[PDB]
Amino acid sequence: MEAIPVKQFVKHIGELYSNNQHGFSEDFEEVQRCTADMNITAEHSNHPENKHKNRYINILAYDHSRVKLRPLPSKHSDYINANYVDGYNKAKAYIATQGPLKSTFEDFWRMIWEQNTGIIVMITNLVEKGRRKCDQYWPTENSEEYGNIIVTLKSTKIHACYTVRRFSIRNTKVQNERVVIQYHYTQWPDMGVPEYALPVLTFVRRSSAARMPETGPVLVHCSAGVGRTGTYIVIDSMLQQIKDKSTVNVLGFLKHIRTQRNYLVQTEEQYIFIHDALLEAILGKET
Numbered sequence: 001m002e003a004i005p006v007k008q009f010v011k012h013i014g015e016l017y018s019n020n021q022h023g024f025s026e027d028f029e030e031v032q033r034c035t036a037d038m039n040i041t042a043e044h045s046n047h048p049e050n051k052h053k054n055r056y057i058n059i060l061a062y063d064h065s066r067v068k069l070r071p072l073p074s075k076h077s078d079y080i081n082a083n084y085v086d087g088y089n090k091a092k093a094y095i096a097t098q099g100p101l102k103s104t105f106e107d108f109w110r111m112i113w114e115q116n117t118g119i120i121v122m123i124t125n126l127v128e129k130g131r132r133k134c135d136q137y138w139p140t141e142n143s144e145e146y147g148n149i150i151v152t153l154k155s156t157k158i159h160a161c162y163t164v165r166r167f168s169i170r171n172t173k174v175q176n177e178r179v180v181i182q183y184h185y186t187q188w189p190d191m192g193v194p195e196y197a198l199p200v201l202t203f204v205r206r207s208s209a210a211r212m213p214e215t216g217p218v219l220v221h222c223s224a225g226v227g228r229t230g231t232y233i234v235i236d237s238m239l240q241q242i243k244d245k246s247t248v249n250v251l252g253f254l255k256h257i258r259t260q261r262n263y264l265v266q267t268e269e270q271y272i273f274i275h276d277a278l279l280e281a282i283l284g285k286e287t
Contacts (some may be wrong), residue, residue: 003249006242006282013279027251028268034255049076055098059224065260067095080107083261085233088240094233095217096261098225099124099134106147108137113149113171116216120182121207123228129190133223148173161187161199183207193269197277208236230264234274
């Protein structure tokens, strides 16, 4: 599949790092240019009624892959800045989305309900170095109402680098009650990428393993829902590919998902960090 054997992975890393990381720069420029001769529309994102529902004006939801809310008894009531994103050998394994705004809390929770999503992966802090990145769309304790969905915090589990929050959500218009587990990574740096890949590895595996059978896509968000979100999706997907085929196709998979949401894996640093992480994962398994 134009993939690399796991055994060659270590060697491939060497190459990409060699010659002042020329390999990595080529690869990421290819990722960046892979849309060059593709115009992917995001028209609903820029409809006047929907512009306030985007956290970042340049981070849009491609029309073709966007998650649509069921329309309401409400012109653009169907829009949320969210896109289906493929996982390894499974279409629409994820919903990549922005960290919701106060204004989109209802949309966000309704999407989770309507998509049969049971896992939230959140890869941001609410505020970072004094900068707002994400509004708190869950109750600090007990219940909160977001439109037709009431969210009850049931249990919280705080690890070194991530917090797990077990929520019970109920649709007041509907069974009516669903468990939704948020895995909240809490140690992503203000700037750049994590120095140590292992906590991120650990986070991916546990959050990934929480995906239960016959459930809707896992929702992954950070602030904008492209950089860290894209990084998560690639690491998780490639770990599945390694498990399933003992191969890796980071460049191939990423070029693919770039068509489904804009800027997934937003930086070359993120691109390299993916490789570091898979390297550590592979060398972990080897021992």
